[PDB]
Design an enzyme around this catalytic site. Structure first.
Site, PDB file in Angstrom:
ATOM      1  N   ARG B  53       8.470   6.153   7.949  1.00  0.00           N
ATOM      2  CA  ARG B  53       7.998   7.519   8.172  1.00  0.00           C
ATOM      3  C   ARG B  53       6.624   7.469   8.824  1.00  0.00           C
ATOM      4  O   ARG B  53       5.619   7.228   8.148  1.00  0.00           O
ATOM      5  CB  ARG B  53       7.958   8.294   6.857  1.00  0.00           C
ATOM      6  CG  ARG B  53       7.623   9.768   7.003  1.00  0.00           C
ATOM      7  CD  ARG B  53       8.050  10.545   5.768  1.00  0.00           C
ATOM      8  NE  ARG B  53       7.649  11.947   5.827  1.00  0.00           N
ATOM      9  CZ  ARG B  53       6.513  12.428   5.340  1.00  0.00           C
ATOM     10  NH1 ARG B  53       5.623  11.645   4.751  1.00  0.00           N
ATOM     11  NH2 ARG B  53       6.262  13.730   5.447  1.00  0.00           N
ATOM     12  N   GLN B  61       3.491   5.623   7.016  1.00  0.00           N
ATOM     13  CA  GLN B  61       3.930   5.317   5.663  1.00  0.00           C
ATOM     14  C   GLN B  61       4.803   4.072   5.675  1.00  0.00           C
ATOM     15  O   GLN B  61       5.426   3.740   6.686  1.00  0.00           O
ATOM     16  CB  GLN B  61       4.702   6.498   5.053  1.00  0.00           C
ATOM     17  CG  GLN B  61       5.102   6.306   3.600  1.00  0.00           C
ATOM     18  CD  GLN B  61       5.743   7.544   3.008  1.00  0.00           C
ATOM     19  OE1 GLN B  61       5.867   8.573   3.674  1.00  0.00           O
ATOM     20  NE2 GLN B  61       6.152   7.454   1.748  1.00  0.00           N
ATOM     21  N   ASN B 100       3.513   9.077  -3.586  1.00  0.00           N
ATOM     22  CA  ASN B 100       4.153   9.381  -4.856  1.00  0.00           C
ATOM     23  C   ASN B 100       4.949  10.670  -4.726  1.00  0.00           C
ATOM     24  O   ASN B 100       4.746  11.461  -3.801  1.00  0.00           O
ATOM     25  CB  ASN B 100       3.124   9.500  -5.988  1.00  0.00           C
ATOM     26  CG  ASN B 100       2.029  10.505  -5.680  1.00  0.00           C
ATOM     27  OD1 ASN B 100       2.177  11.354  -4.801  1.00  0.00           O
ATOM     28  ND2 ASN B 100       0.921  10.411  -6.405  1.00  0.00           N
ATOM     29  N   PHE B 111       0.550   4.727   2.275  1.00  0.00           N
ATOM     30  CA  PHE B 111       0.404   5.425   3.541  1.00  0.00           C
ATOM     31  C   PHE B 111      -1.031   5.309   4.034  1.00  0.00           C
ATOM     32  O   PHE B 111      -1.982   5.252   3.248  1.00  0.00           O
ATOM     33  CB  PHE B 111       0.815   6.900   3.430  1.00  0.00           C
ATOM     34  CG  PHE B 111      -0.056   7.715   2.514  1.00  0.00           C
ATOM     35  CD1 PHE B 111       0.256   7.844   1.171  1.00  0.00           C
ATOM     36  CD2 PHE B 111      -1.176   8.370   3.001  1.00  0.00           C
ATOM     37  CE1 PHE B 111      -0.538   8.600   0.331  1.00  0.00           C
ATOM     38  CE2 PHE B 111      -1.972   9.127   2.165  1.00  0.00           C
ATOM     39  CZ  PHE B 111      -1.651   9.244   0.829  1.00  0.00           C
ATOM     40  N   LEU B 120      -5.021  16.835   0.316  1.00  0.00           N
ATOM     41  CA  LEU B 120      -4.376  15.805  -0.487  1.00  0.00           C
ATOM     42  C   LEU B 120      -5.286  15.240  -1.570  1.00  0.00           C
ATOM     43  O   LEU B 120      -4.838  14.400  -2.357  1.00  0.00           O
ATOM     44  CB  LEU B 120      -3.888  14.662   0.411  1.00  0.00           C
ATOM     45  CG  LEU B 120      -2.835  15.017   1.465  1.00  0.00           C
ATOM     46  CD1 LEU B 120      -2.442  13.779   2.258  1.00  0.00           C
ATOM     47  CD2 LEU B 120      -1.609  15.651   0.824  1.00  0.00           C
ATOM     48  N   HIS B 124      -3.064  12.181  -4.433  1.00  0.00           N
ATOM     49  CA  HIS B 124      -2.714  10.805  -4.116  1.00  0.00           C
ATOM     50  C   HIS B 124      -3.943   9.927  -4.288  1.00  0.00           C
ATOM     51  O   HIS B 124      -5.048  10.304  -3.886  1.00  0.00           O
ATOM     52  CB  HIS B 124      -2.174  10.680  -2.686  1.00  0.00           C
ATOM     53  CG  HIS B 124      -1.013  11.581  -2.399  1.00  0.00           C
ATOM     54  ND1 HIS B 124      -1.161  12.930  -2.158  1.00  0.00           N
ATOM     55  CD2 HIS B 124       0.314  11.327  -2.321  1.00  0.00           C
ATOM     56  CE1 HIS B 124       0.026  13.468  -1.940  1.00  0.00           C
ATOM     57  NE2 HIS B 124       0.938  12.517  -2.034  1.00  0.00           N
TER      58      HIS B 124
END
Ligand SMILES: [Mg+2]
Ligand SMILES: [Zn+2]
Lengths: 726, 162
Positions: B53, B61, B100, B111, B120, B124
């Site tokens: 990804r 990622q 996650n 990532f 974010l 994370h």
RNA sequence: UCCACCAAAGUUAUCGCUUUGGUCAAUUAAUGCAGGUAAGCAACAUCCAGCAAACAGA
DNA sequence: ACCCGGGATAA
DNA sequence: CGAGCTGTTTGCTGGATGTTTATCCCGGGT
């Protein structure tokens, strides 16, 4: 030594060799079809003969041998040595062939070419005979008593007498006494007369009832006398001579519009059922061998199909004396392995003793079995602060059952529900010839589609159950990927995402390709798709990559994958047993953790009869499982245990009014009185603040367990039940 | 602070190397797990794991060494471990953090951010930076698509600790 | 036509009560427990009588 | 003559 | 114990009985 048998469950995919999977599947289906017809055809014969003539010798035909001929008549095979047939076999075959053509025309059935059908016929017919005998021995007496009550017109007489006496202003007790004197006693006299085969005295029954009794007794031989003078005992002692009478009883039950009951056992499940497989069946049908297999080569034949060295097939039991004997039972998904030790060659807590009662000190667990709360458990040492309370609810056990039921309800195709509704217009338990023939025709008109849908696991699937349906992937809050309702996998890296609402719309559909690629790599998804379908799906995915915005590719993929939406009913049925076993073991582990390993269980005496508007309960199975785990279990009466306040032994009442617990009934019956919360009549019951009285509030189960503790303490101290609860 | 490196190959052709700086002192357990996965001490690691990804201008990622599609991966401590701490935030590009499926669902996936991700923060765990080879990171990013699909098969052919 | 488990409070051993904290194998997957890798344990098919969901008719 | 099914019977 | 009159399919609960293996020989082919 005595003979014992144990069964080990497993799955075909886990032990059955792939090359031999397909031969088994078809066999199962074939057997099922035969078995189904082996029931219907059999009934179709009896109702044909009994209606044709009342002198027909129906009793002698209830045997495994006749059922074997009935089963074989549905199988086409090369002619054998006809002159070697026995007279009984010849008569059975002639009787079958008398109605064979008519039954085939009615059911639109054709014989199935199945060589070496002897053993399957023998097993299935033995099962059929056992089912017939068990049904009759169990229900003949109850149905006869119901017919006697109907003949006596007990309900009409009771109603008329009650109304007449009420019109005269008689007291209720006097009314009941008069009813007993004038209604119940003559009814008992009629019961006694019928039980001994003697007609009731004149005036007890009208002419029509006497004629019906004579007709019923004409079924038995004139000189035949019931053993020990009781018909109910003779039925168990000599059942074979009552079968015909049973049929007549059914008709009489239908004469007075009584609810029909299944006099003749039948197989109606469309899902294929379990069938027995032995060494001969494996050799001749699964292995397709063409020579006799002796006992010495018994295990070698099985070794070619299943791994006998696995855990399931190895020795088990005390001293490993229970060995596998080459007999299994399978329905196309699940398998049961039978092990046996021999070759195939042919109390209340109030009545406990002083020592027994006193050895449980500090270990008794008081349980209140409820409807929604299956087990409310409390230990002796429980206090207001030290709340050693455990609750095992109906939801915990019914999780899987409710999930499967909802899934089946949501995934039921329109064709299947319509077919079931149409088929439900004809009764099956009725013994009437015309009704049974109509049901046979109706089933034959819809059997194909229902068998295809319920047999989708191994049978061919062609019908489009979900026309013009488009399926789009979705992700839940727990990052689990579902097609529409089929679990795919848990995406552990889903949350990391950029700002929402990108500029390009087509990315939303482009994510469909990624979801499809993730889904297609799953074992349980790949195994359900054949090579051609997988190739077409991959080509359509490539086309989607070429033109993501085009919905035609998505529609074609949905049409191809519609097979994945069919539920594996047999797999769900098998998983239900595992879920139940896991729930039982979880309950045992929780009981041992919370109340200790050596806990003593005291359960209420409530019997929990199956009641309308209420789901079933494991009352007896629960006790059996608890005893099987080694828990000392005793029963305590629940008389007045849930009616008095433990703090002051005063009566309780249902005071609070709450909306209907069941949401669907709120619109019709919005508010009802509460059932699990009670308040005491003492009106102080506590160090109340006097602002609004504030009567002490008790949970019904908690009060019941506290009263159980009171009863146990009184029994320990004086060996007598408390006067209040006596 | 331990430093680790990955060798990136596209369609079997190496394209460069990326060097990471780990916050061993600030996030001990996560950094140790990442180092173990990089070096494959426990018999498994990022070696051969694909970058399943890559969203251009946003993120890369990877780290799925059991499924190569984001549905796999496991940590040395078990299937998953609770969030350790949030002493670091997505304040600058090039930050390496754990992916996650919600709180206390950290695994082996990781990532690398190419732009600030203030939204974010607190969701994370940030446990590293990119010190060298960021040009290789941009080269890998250029092969991504907005939906996350990669124009070519990008895998971590080798991984190690400097 | 709905409800998985463990705790705190309204509260008084307080509800198919409400407000919060913690847990998750999700499942149309698989013989189920535990032991950590060995070695033990576990009845199942059919039929029938009831009861619950969907539909249709009184 | 010699063998290969496959139905049918029976403990 | 607790909540408001008929038919099919499913299922959940309850009750009753079992859980194969040799032997013969006639039709048919070579
Ligand atoms: Mg009770
Ligand atoms: Zn009181």
């Amino acid at each position: 030594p005595s003979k014992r048998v144990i069964t080990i469950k497993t799955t075909i995919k886990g032990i059955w060799k792939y090359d031999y999977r397909q031969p088994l599947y078809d066999l199962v289906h074939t057997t099922n079809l035969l078995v189904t017809h082996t029931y219907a055809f059999t009934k179709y014969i009896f109702l044909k003969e009994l209606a044709t003539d009342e002198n027909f010798a129906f009793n002698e035909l209830i045997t495994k041998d006749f059922f074997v001929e009935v089963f074989l008549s549905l199988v086409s095979a090369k002619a054998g040595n006809s002159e070697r047939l026995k007279d009984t076999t010849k008569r059975y075959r002639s009787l079958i062939g008398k109605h064979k053509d008519a039954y085939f025309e009615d059911a639109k059935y054709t014989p199935i070419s199945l060589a070496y059908a002897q053993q399957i016929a023998l097993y299935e017919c033995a099962k059929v005979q056992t089912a017939y005998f068990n049904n009759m021995k169990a229900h003949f007496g109850n149905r006869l008593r119901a017919l006697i009550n109907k003949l006596f017109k007990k309900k009409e007489k009771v109603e008329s007498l009650t109304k007449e006496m009420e019109a005269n202003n008689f007291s209720i007790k006097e009314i009941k006494q008069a009813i007993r004197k004038n209604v119940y006693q003559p009814c008992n006299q009629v019961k006694l007369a019928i039980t001994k085969k003697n007609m009731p005295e004149s005036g007890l029954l009208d002419d029509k009832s006497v004629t019906q009794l004579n007709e019923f007794f004409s079924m038995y031989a004139v000189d035949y006398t019931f053993q020990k003078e009781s018909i109910f005992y003779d039925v168990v002692a000599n059942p074979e001579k009552h079968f015909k009478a049973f049929y007549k009883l059914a008709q009489l039950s239908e004469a007075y519009e009584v609810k029909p009951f299944a006099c003749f056992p039948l197989r109606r499940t469309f899902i294929p059922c379990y069938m027995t497989v032995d060494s001969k069946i494996l050799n001749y049908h699964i292995l397709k061998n063409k020579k006799v297999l002796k006992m010495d080569e018994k295990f070698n034949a099985w070794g070619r199909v299943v791994n006998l060295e696995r855990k399931a097939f190895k020795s088990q039991g005390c001293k490993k004396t229970l060995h596998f004997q080459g007999t299994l039972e399978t329905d196309g998904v699940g398998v049961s392995i039978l092990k046996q030790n021999t070759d195939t060659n042919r109390k209340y807590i109030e009545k406990l003793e002083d020592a027994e009662l006193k050895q449980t000190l500090g270990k008794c667990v008081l349980m209140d079995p409820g409807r929604r709360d299956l087990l409310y458990c409390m230990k002796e040492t429980s206090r207001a602060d030290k709340k050693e309370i455990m609750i095992f609810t109906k939801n915990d056990r019914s999780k899987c059952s409710r999930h499967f039921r909802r899934l089946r309800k949501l995934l039921q195709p329109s064709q299947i529900r319509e077919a079931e509704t149409y088929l439900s217009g004809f009764a099956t338990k009725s013994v009437n010839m015309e009704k049974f023939v109509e049901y046979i025709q109706a089933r034959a008109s819809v059997k194909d589609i229902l068998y295809e849908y319920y047999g989708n696991e191994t049978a061919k699937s062609i019908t489009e159950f979900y026309p013009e349906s488009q399926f789009d992937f979705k992700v839940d809050q727990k990052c689990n990927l579902y097609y529409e309702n089929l679990f795919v996998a848990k995406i552990r890296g889903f949350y990391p995402q950029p700002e929402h609402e990108p500029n390009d719309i087509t990315l939303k559909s482009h994510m469909y390709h990624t979801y499809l690629q993730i889904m297609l790599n799953q074992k349980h998804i790949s195994e359900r798709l054949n090579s051609e379908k997988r190739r077409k799906i991959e080509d359509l995915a490539k086309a989607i990559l070429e033109q993501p915005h085009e919905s035609g590719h998505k529609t074609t993929i949905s049409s191809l994958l519609g097979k994945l939406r069919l539920l594996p009913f047999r797999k769900m049925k098998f998983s239900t047993k595992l879920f139940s076993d896991n729930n039982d073991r979880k309950l045992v582990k929780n009981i041992k953790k919370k109340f200790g390993a050596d806990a003593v269980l005291v359960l209420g005496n409530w019997s929990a009869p199956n009641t309308k508007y209420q789901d079933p309960t494991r009352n007896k199975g629960l006790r059996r499982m608890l005893k099987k785990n080694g828990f000392p279990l005793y029963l305590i009466d629940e008389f007045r245990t849930s009616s008095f306040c433990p703090k002051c032994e005063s009566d309780l009442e249902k005071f609070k009014v709450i909306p209907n617990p069941r949401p669907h009934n709120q619109e019709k019956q919005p508010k009802v009185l509460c059932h699990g919360l009670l308040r005491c009549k003492n009106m102080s019951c506590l160090e109340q603040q006097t602002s609004e009285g504030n009567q002490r509030l008790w949970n019904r189960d908690q009060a019941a367990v506290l009263n159980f503790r009171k009863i146990l303490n009184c029994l320990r101290e004086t060996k007598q039940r408390p006067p209040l609860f006596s | 602070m331990s430093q680790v490196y990955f060798d990136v190959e596209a369609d079997g052709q190496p394209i460069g190397r990326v060097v990471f700086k780990l916050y061993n002192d600030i996030v001990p357990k996560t950094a140790e797990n990442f180092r173990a996965l990089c070096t494959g001490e426990k018999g498994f690691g990022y070696a051969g794991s694909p970058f399943h990804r890559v969203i251009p201008d946003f993120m890369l990622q990877g780290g799925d060494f059991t499924a190569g599609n984001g549905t796999g991966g496991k940590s040395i401590y078990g299937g998953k471990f609770p969030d350790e701490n949030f002493k670091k935030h997505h304040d600058r590009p090039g930050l390496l953090s754990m992916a996650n499926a919600g709180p206390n669902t950290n695994g082996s996936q990781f990532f690398i951010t190419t732009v600030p991700c203030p939204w974010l923060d607190g969701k994370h765990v940030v446990f590293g930076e990119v010190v060298d080879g960021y040009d290789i990171v941009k080269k890998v990013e250029s092969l991504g698509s907005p939906s996350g699909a990669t124009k070519a098969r990008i895998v971590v052919a080798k991984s190690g600790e400097l």
